[PDB]
Ligand binder design. Structure first.
Ligand SMILES: OC[C@H]1O[C@@H](O[C@H]2[C@H](O)[C@@H](O)[C@H](O[C@H]3[C@H](O)[C@@H](O)[C@H](O[C@H]4[C@H](O)[C@@H](O)[C@H](O)O[C@@H]4CO)O[C@@H]3CO)O[C@@H]2CO)[C@H](O)[C@@H](O)[C@@H]1O
Ligand SMILES: OC[C@H]1O[C@@H](O[C@H]2[C@H](O)[C@@H](O)[C@H](O[C@H]3[C@H](O)[C@@H](O)[C@H](O[C@H]4[C@H](O)[C@@H](O)[C@H](O)O[C@@H]4CO)O[C@@H]3CO)O[C@@H]2CO)[C@H](O)[C@@H](O)[C@@H]1O
Ligand SMILES: [Zn+2]
Length: 472
């Protein structure tokens, strides 16, 4: 069957199914409704930064159309919706004055979701640092971010937490560190070569450390001030793509494990165990910040659940670990990613060049976290694939590859859960075609098609697949 035996009965009782968006990628009204600019507004408005010089000024206009979109997700039998709050829509300068119109938007969205029986899962941050904070403080390079973020989090807890019971602090701090401060291809465009300045060997580590400390501080505030009354939960969202040793050699198995540690362990070892992975300590040395005992105790156990964004997989090839002059976070791993084995590609690519369709990577990642980290509560917070630009409406709607993608990946997730993985939910990226960062509107991740001329929504085949699979 096109469902391939999948249904709600195939997953645990009360397992949560949802869809996901992020504020800058879908809201629009970027310079309206009192919203202050984020680092992404400045970046996207700079010629050459985004495909077609596009930006999120309008995006999908969810700001005006949110009731349509909530009605749609309910009609598709989802239980939950993961979305983010734009920090600069609430605090235009990132601190100080509250934009009441911004608060009203999120109140209206949250209240409508609840009215329609859809549980809000709310990210506080999804790349969209208020521009004022980047300029005034230097953003995530400044340890002061922990205070600034905690104050923002506190406001959101006080204002929405009587209704919102499932929070996340950050989204993919690895990608912020990597693209923002190693490669310099996402804002603030810092790197060793870069015009904005930077240092690809040091700054990614500073940035990751500050995300961890900020997360911990916000959760401490939640727990000491709000949790008794509100009885909700706060986690964090981390990207994890699977790494499989290219061969069974000692060097290749070591390489795969080293890649896992530099990718997910970077955040999970502090969050679960109260220290950075040993291999990162050994190789990165003085460039890896040291948690004080007090900080390590604040960070350890500070996530009520682990959000995992799972998309793809690669093989890893190793070599002799060698003494080398530091150049970058990326180079620190001392591995080589490989995308074929025995002359066969690991999987076909979706529109995004990085996205190889490898359903067994989902099993790989979930099983690994179960076995390595004491089976913490995991929520699959993003999973999905993209179509290319310039197709017809009907070609977008007949998204057979995406149907196959979800069936295959969810079957692999089911396999891991049946083997005892503590997975509490799954969220499809994305509800809607949207603004896909550097790709702008040239990458289509939605289960719902968005016509970017008219802004009309049209559910794709994959949307109806979910509707069938999820019927109560
Ligand atoms: O309907 C609106 C909209 O839908 C779009 O998507 C369609 C798919 O294109 C179409 O293939 C899909 O058909 C499903 C059908 O809904 C299922 O009921 C059926 O399941 C069978 C199954 O094949 C058996 O193996 C199993 O044992 O039993 C069940 C029946 O009980 O599977 C087929 C696919 O093979 O339905 C979607 C939603 O309608 C269309 O693309 C678009 O044209 C429509 O406007
Ligand atoms: O894009 C959809 C959606 O997903 C979330 O973010 C995406 C990013 O958009 C995308 O840039 C990022 O790309 C990763 C890729 O997944 C990794 O496999 C790859 O990893 C490297 C590793 O860093 C190297 O050190 C190692 O040697 O090799 C591996 C494999 O080549 O790195 C690239 C970036 O360089 O993937 C993200 C998801 O993982 C966002 O949440 C959402 O908003 C986006 O819309
Ligand atoms: Zn509008």
């Amino acid at each position: 069957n096109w469902l391939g035996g999948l249904s709600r009965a195939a997953f645990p009782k009360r397992f949560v199914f949802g869809t996901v968006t992020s504020a800058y990628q879908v809201e629009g009204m970027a310079a309206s409704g009192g919203r202050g600019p984020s680092i992404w507004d400045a970046f996207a408005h700079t010629p050459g930064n985004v495909a077609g010089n596009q930006n999120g000024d309008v995006a999908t206009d969810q700001y005006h159309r949110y009731k349509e979109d909530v009605n749609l997700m309910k009609s598709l039998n989802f239980d939950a919706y993961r979305f983010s709050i734009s920090w600069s829509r609430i605090f235009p300068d990132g601190e100080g004055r509250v934009n009441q119109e911004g608060v009203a938007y999120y109140n209206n969205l949250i209240n409508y979701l609840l009215q329609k029986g859809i549980t809000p899962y709310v990210n506080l941050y999804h790349y969209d640092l208020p521009l004022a904070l980047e300029k005034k403080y230097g953003g995530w390079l400044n340890a002061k971010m922990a205070d600034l973020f905690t104050e923002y989090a506190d406001f959101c807890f006080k204002t929405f937490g009587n209704r919102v019971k499932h929070w996340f602090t950050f989204n993919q701090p690895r990608i912020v560190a990597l693209l923002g401060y190693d490669a310099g291809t996402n804002p603030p465009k810092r790197c060793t070569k870069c015009a904005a300045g930077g240092n690809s060997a040091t700054e990614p580590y500073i940035v990751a450390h500050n995300f961890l400390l900020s997360h911990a501080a916000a959760v401490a505030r939640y727990r000491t001030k709000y949790q008794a009354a509100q009885q909700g939960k706060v986690g964090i969202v981390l990207d994890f793509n699977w790494y499989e040793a290219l061969s069974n050699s000692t060097e290749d198995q070591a390489a795969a494990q080293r890649a896992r540690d530099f990718h997910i362990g970077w955040y999970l070892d502090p969050l679960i165990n109260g220290h950075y992975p040993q291999i990162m300590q050994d190789l990165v040395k003085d460039r890896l910040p040291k948690f004080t005992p007090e900080q390590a105790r604040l960070v350890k156990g500070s996530a009520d659940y682990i959000g995992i964004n799972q998309y793809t997989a690669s093989y890893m090839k190793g070599q002799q670990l060698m003494q080398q002059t530091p150049t970058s976070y990326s180079a620190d791993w001392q591995v080589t990613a490989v995308f074929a084995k025995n002359g066969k590609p690991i999987g076909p690519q979706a529109n995004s060049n990085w996205l190889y369709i490898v359903p067994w990577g989902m099993y790989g990642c979930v099983n690994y976290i179960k076995q390595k980290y004491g089976n913490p509560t995991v929520v699959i917070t993003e999973n999905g694939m993209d179509q290319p630009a310039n197709l017809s409406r009907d070609q977008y709607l007949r998204d057979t590859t995406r149907v196959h993608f979800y069936r295959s990946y969810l079957t692999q997730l089911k396999k891991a859960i049946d083997e005892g993985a503590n997975v509490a939910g799954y969220f499809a990226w994305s509800l809607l075609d949207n603004f896909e960062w550097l790709s702008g509107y040239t990458s289509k991740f939605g289960i719902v098609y968005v016509d970017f001329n008219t802004l009309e929504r049209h559910p794709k085949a994959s949307a109806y697949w979910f509707r069938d699979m999820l019927k109560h």
